Amino acid sequence: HMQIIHTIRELRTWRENTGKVAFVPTMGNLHEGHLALVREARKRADNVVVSIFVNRLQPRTLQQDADKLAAEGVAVVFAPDEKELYPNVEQRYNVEPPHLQNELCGKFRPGHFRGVATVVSKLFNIVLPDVACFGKKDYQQLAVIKGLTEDLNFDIEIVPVDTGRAADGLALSSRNRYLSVGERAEAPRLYRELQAVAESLKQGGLDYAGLERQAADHLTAAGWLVDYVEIRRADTLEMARAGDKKLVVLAAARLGTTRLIDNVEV
Amino acid sequence: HMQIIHTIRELRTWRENTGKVAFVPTMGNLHEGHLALVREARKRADNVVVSIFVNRLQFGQRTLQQDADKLAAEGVAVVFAPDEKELYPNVEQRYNVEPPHLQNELCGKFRPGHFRGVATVVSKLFNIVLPDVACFGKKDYQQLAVIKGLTEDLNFDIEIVPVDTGRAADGLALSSRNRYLSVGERAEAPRLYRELQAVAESLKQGGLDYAGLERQAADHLTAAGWLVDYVEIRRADTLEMARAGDKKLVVLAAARLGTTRLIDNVEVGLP
Ligand SMILES: Nc1ncnc2c1ncn2[C@@H]1O[C@H](COP(=O)(O)OP(=O)(O)NP(=O)(O)O)[C@@H](O)[C@H]1O
Ligand SMILES: Nc1ncnc2c1ncn2[C@@H]1O[C@H](COP(=O)(O)OP(=O)(O)NP(=O)(O)O)[C@@H](O)[C@H]1O
Ligand SMILES: [Mg+2]
């Protein structure tokens, strides 16, 4: 049944003489939001590879992770150590995103999306998948991966998966475990404020900047420390232009020291 | 037997049924130097793809049929000749393979953006052709090191086969740009390799003043009419800076006769 491959060589040996492969890269500490990716992967290929890797370029629960994936019919858990993927100290050749890497979440995480684009390219060249699933909660990550896939001619179908949420709307994330009881009760307001922006856009709203500030002002007045609220073009995160019909609203804000992100496509 | 394929989709469809593939990326205008790579590729796989592709906006800062004709005799199965829009549909390349500081040394110092563009278009071609084996000429020694580097760092499962420089009778490294040389310039061109060899001979004889050998070669080419970009002694393969006791060395040079920039190198193995 399920197999745990730790080397590039063993992964490739398994993958040759296998048909269609759907691939889900993760960093472990798996939760229900990740399984939405795995379940969608299994609906697009019989053989699903889930990688678990923590990337020094961008909380180990290995046994509990693999049991959850086993019950979802995953074929291979690829969990290499750091030296397997980075045999030298440095990563000399990096996949360099455009200026997007310094916007939104990238502004306070320099080097982060470069590290995501590089490790995902490495994983792509290791697993050689036909389909790869990524969650929409990390929308900017998704744009970067779609972009590198196109620009580097990776023959891989990128499948966005919808954000799994709690009953009150909060996007599922391992970050949510940091919230105190008080902050967790307040955390659903992020998605509430994004939805009301999407409704204003649905009801013919034209002032992008006005809507972003209002949501930001509501969060700040309720105790949040807002990093950004931004309306951008869906999928690509290109600048929103007046008259665009495929939009997305994104925000990042801190309750205490925990930074939460969410988004709504309008 | 030989096919000319222009689209990525047709290349992928052909490649899918085929087993092992050896790959030779070129900018066309093919000469015997190129055919050396093609012969090496043909020794290692039944199916050899040669790509012909230029994009002067991204890297690089004879007709196709005439090129295809030279390859048809050599057992090439596919000439892959996409146009600019096929590989760069938005013109802009948003995601680039970024080399380390190496990209700004040696030829990189005189060719801003060039090795980033080479690294990127080679990765793209690797992802289109999906070869088992790719051949590159040692004449472009820094380029070869850049391609070995990205192949390892990005985990491309591709064997990188270097191929020795094919030369004219008088030693001049074969190159498409040699056609642009005046009669007088062409007769002067073999001095570059000659001086590189005399540097290698000083090294094989225990010479330790690397800086002085570099300067003498550059001053001599300068005195002979050339405009020298550089002459440098480096560690072989990695192109790291050479140190006093080093045994595996390469001497590299780039220099211009009038309008034409020429490069060459000589490897040295010291006992
Ligand atoms: N609630 C969610 N719904 C859908 N996809 C999700 C969700 N949370 C994460 N994902 C996706 O699953 C992958 C998560 O990788 P990983 O960073 O290991 O999880 P994470 O929850 O985002 N870590 P954290 O920074 O603590 O939130 C990415 O493709 C995410 O887009
Ligand atoms: N004389 C040569 N001997 C061996 N390999 C060579 C030689 N010249 C070129 N190659 C290799 O052939 C491949 C295609 O190189 P390409 O840039 O298309 O040729 P080129 O002659 O250097 N073009 P140009 O710089 O315009 O004159 C590369 O891997 C080169 O390193
Ligand atoms: Mg050429």
From TrEMBL, chain B:
(R)-pantoate binds at Q58, Q143. The active site is at H34 (proton donor). Its main location: cytoplasm. GO terms for cellular component: cytosol. Coiled coil: none annotated. InterPro entries: Cyt_trans-like (IPR004821), Pantoate_ligase (IPR003721), Pantoate_ligase_C (IPR042176), Rossmann-like_a/b/a_fold (IPR014729). It holds the Pfam family Pantoate_ligase. It catalyses: (R)-pantoate + beta-alanine + ATP = (R)-pantothenate + AMP + diphosphate + H(+). Pathway: Cofactor biosynthesis; (R)-pantothenate biosynthesis; (R)-pantothenate from (R)-pantoate and beta-alanine: step 1/1. ATP binds at residues 27-34, 137-140, 166, 174-177. Transmembrane segments: none annotated. It is an enzyme of class 6 (ligase). It is found in: Cytoplasm. NCBIfam families: cyt_tran_rel, panC. Homodimer. PANTHER family: CYTIDYLATE KINASE/PANTOATE-BETA-ALANINE LIGASE, PANTOATE--BETA-ALANINE LIGASE. The reaction proceeds by a bi uni uni bi ping pong mechanism. This is Pantothenate synthetase. It comes from Neisseria gonorrhoeae (strain NCCP11945).
